[PDB]
């Protein structure tokens, strides 16, 4: 609910537009400033982070940092932000955990005010109240942010999907979303990542079923390559390993921090004595182990090339091994997969083929996005989290749902959307850019 009569709204993207990552969206209501996410981008073509010079010059007015989910595209730059500025950090139980770990990992001694929020939390400020709602993503406890103004709600979806099989901390708040919609949404800021792809995602249970049928035929050792970010896909192989009386080992010699924190907080459903350390692998027959190679940048692929070319520090591929790629390939990574496949074949490994009829994504396709648009019914729309072609795609979806085209804004980094109370205008441009580290 609303506090006072507001005058000025400003919306400034410093990251996540005209590119696919580095989420950072500034929202101002009068004299108060809020930062929605603080992602990094893995330089394609270490890391890249947004230019926050605009924020620093107006540091006095930054009331909070709001973090939608635990991925590096949301919270990857937070440590670097907190070095230059002191503001309170708001996020879910899991998101705060992962941020704190990033701070511990960088040996940063700065004292930080962390506020754990949930879909029942309602954070109060001078000009506005902020609420939250659960979304569906590849990681549990993902939140949408709802900034309540006199003009209506400013909603930032974060990254989201709509899957009728995900039903835990992965489940969405369709009633809280419908209520936000009818109370009236002034502005919607939504994920455009798969806005070009017609229809829907393949449901996760369908993907799991096809993985099961594939893995059940494997007579030898099985190695699965995954993104560490994709908690669902990891949960899926744990389920399958258990039903096939196989045991699971990650690449060594300890367990991946994100996975291991979430595991210790009870986010994974793991039976007893299912994980064996990589040091205990040799003891078991080849057909009783599933090895999972996780990573972030695209190492998941690199690791298999190093396992094929003998040449892995820990463990190498043997003839009769089965390989499965439980990832979704960026066009930048299509060639290195084809090299790796060749080397896998030479080393005499069986390639479990991906079903081409399956579409796996953390992000909603056209119909999923239209779903959020139909629910929200925003007056103004700002498609983000995509390149220019993706933003356009999302805009056409919005126009179809009945948002006025005059009220849809396609913006670049540093663009400033202002609302006087009469007209919404793109009238300014501020300092923005890419800081490589
Ligand atoms: Mn994500």
The pairing of strands 9-15 and 415-419 is antiparallel
Q: Are 221 and 287 in contact (CB under 8 A)?
A: yes
Experimental method reported for this structure: X-ray
Q: For residue 321, how far is its CA from the centre of ligand 1 (angstroms)?
A: 31
User: In what order do the strands lie in the sheet containing 289-295?
Assistant: 247-250, 289-295, 222-227, 322-325, 350-351
| Residue 172 CA: distances (Å) to CA of 131, 177, 394 | 15, 9, 21
Report the top-level CATH class of 204-351: alpha beta
Q: For residue 24, how far is its CA from the centre of ligand 1 (angstroms)?
A: 13
Cα–Cα distance measured from residue 417 to residue 22, given in angstroms and rounded to the nearest whole number: 20
User: In what order do the strands lie in the sheet containing 89-91?
Assistant: 114-116, 89-91, 62-67, 32-36, 24-29, 9-15, 415-419, 424-429
Q: For residue 138, how far is its CA from the centre of ligand 1 (angstroms)?
A: 7
Measured in degrees and rounded to the nearest 5, phi and psi for residue 202 equal -65, 130
Cα–Cα distance measured from residue 215 to residue 148, given in angstroms and rounded to the nearest whole number: 49
Q: Which residues contact 382 (CB under 8 A, 6 or more apart)?
A: 11, 187, 188, 189, 190, 408, 409, 411, 417
As to burial, measured by CB atoms within 10 angstroms (0-12 exposed, 13-18 middle, 19+ buried), residue 311 is exposed
Show binding-site residues for Zn(2+).
69, 71, 137, 159
Q: For residue 362, how far is its CA from the centre of ligand 1 (angstroms)?
A: 6
Residue labelled with tokens 């003839």: 319
Q: For residue 137, how far is its CA from the centre of ligand 1 (angstroms)?
A: 7
* Token reading at 98: 């992962």
Q: For residue 152, how far is its CA from the centre of ligand 1 (angstroms)?
A: 27
Cα–Cα distance measured from residue 369 to residue 392, given in angstroms and rounded to the nearest whole number: 13
Show binding-site residues.
69, 71, 137, 159, 359-363
Q: Which DSSP category does 320 fall into?
A: T
Q: For residue 345, how far is its CA from the centre of ligand 1 (angstroms)?
A: 32
Show binding-site residues for substrate.
359-363
Q: For residue 254, how far is its CA from the centre of ligand 1 (angstroms)?
A: 24
Q: For residue 347, how far is its CA from the centre of ligand 1 (angstroms)?
A: 34
Q: Which of 303, 310, 346, 306 is nearest to 325 (CA)?
A: 303
Helices (H), 45-172: 53-57, 72-75, 78-84, 93-105
* Token reading at 242: 């258990």
Helices (H), 149-290: 174-183, 204-215, 231-243, 257-264
Q: For residue 375, how far is its CA from the centre of ligand 1 (angstroms)?
A: 21
User: In what order do the strands lie in the sheet containing 122-124?
Assistant: 122-124, 129-135, 142-149, 152-156, 185-191, 378-384
348: left (phi over 0), alpha (psi -120 to 50) or beta: left
Cα–Cα distance measured from residue 231 to residue 214, given in angstroms and rounded to the nearest whole number: 20
* Token reading at 296: 């972030």
Q: Which of 208, 173, 205, 170 is nearest to 70 (CA)?
A: 170
* Token reading at 420: 């006087």
């Amino acid at each position: 609910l609303i506090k006072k009569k507001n005058k000025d709204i400003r919306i400034i993207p410093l990251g996540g537009v005209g590119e696919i990552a580095k989420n950072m969206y500034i929202v101002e209501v009068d004299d108060e400033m809020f930062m929605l996410d603080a992602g990094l981008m893995f330089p394609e073509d270490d890391i890249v982070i947004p230019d926050i010079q605009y924020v620093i010059e107006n540091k006095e007015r930054l009331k909070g940092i709001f973090l939608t989910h635990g991925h590096e595209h949301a919270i990857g730059a937070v440590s670097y932000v907190l070095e230059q500025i002191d503001a309170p950090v708001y996020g879910s139980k899991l998101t705060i955990a992962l941020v704190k770990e990033a701070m511990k990992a960088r040996n940063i001694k700065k004292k930080v005010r962390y506020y754990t929020v949930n879909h029942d939390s309602i954070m109060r400020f001078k000009n506005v109240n902020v609420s939250f709602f659960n979304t569906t993503h590849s990681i549990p406890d993902s939140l949408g942010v709802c900034i309540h103004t006199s003009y209506g709600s400013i909603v930032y979806t974060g990254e989201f999907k709509f899957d009728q099989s995900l039903h835990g901390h992965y489940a969405p708040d369709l009633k809280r979303m419908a209520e936000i919609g009818d109370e009236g949404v002034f502005a919607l800021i939504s994920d455009s990542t798969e806005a070009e792809k017609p229809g829907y995602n393949t449901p996760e249970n369908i993907i799991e079923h096809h993985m099961y049928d594939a893995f059940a035929k494997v007579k030898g050792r099985l190695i699965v390559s995954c993104y560490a970010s994709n908690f669902v896909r990891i949960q899926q192989v744990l389920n399958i390993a258990s039903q096939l009386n196989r045991k699971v080992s990650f690449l060594g010699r300890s367990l991946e921090s994100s996975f291991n924190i979430a595991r210790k907080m009870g986010y994974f459903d793991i039976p007893k004595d299912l994980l064996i350390p990589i040091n205990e692998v040799e003891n078991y027959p080849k057909n009783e182990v599933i090895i999972i190679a996780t990573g972030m940048q695209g190492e998941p692929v690199e690791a298999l090339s190093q396992m094929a070319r003998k040449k892995h520090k820990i463990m190498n591929i043997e003839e009769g091994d089965s390989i499965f790629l439980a990832i979704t390939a960026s066009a930048n990574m299509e060639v290195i997969i084809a090299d790796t496949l060749n080397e896998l074949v030479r080393a005499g490994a069986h390639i479990i083929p991906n079903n081409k009829k399956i579409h796996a994504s953390s992000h909603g396709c056209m119909e999923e996005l239209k779903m959020m648009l139909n629910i929200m019914k925003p007056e103004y729309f700002v498609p983000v989290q995509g390149e220019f072609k993706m933003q356009i795609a999302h805009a056409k979806l919005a126009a179809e749902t009945g948002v006025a085209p005059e009220k849809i804004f396609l913006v670049e980094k540093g663009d400033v959307i202002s609302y006087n109370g009469k007209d919404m205008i793109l009238n300014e441009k501020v300092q923005s850019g890419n800081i490589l580290i």
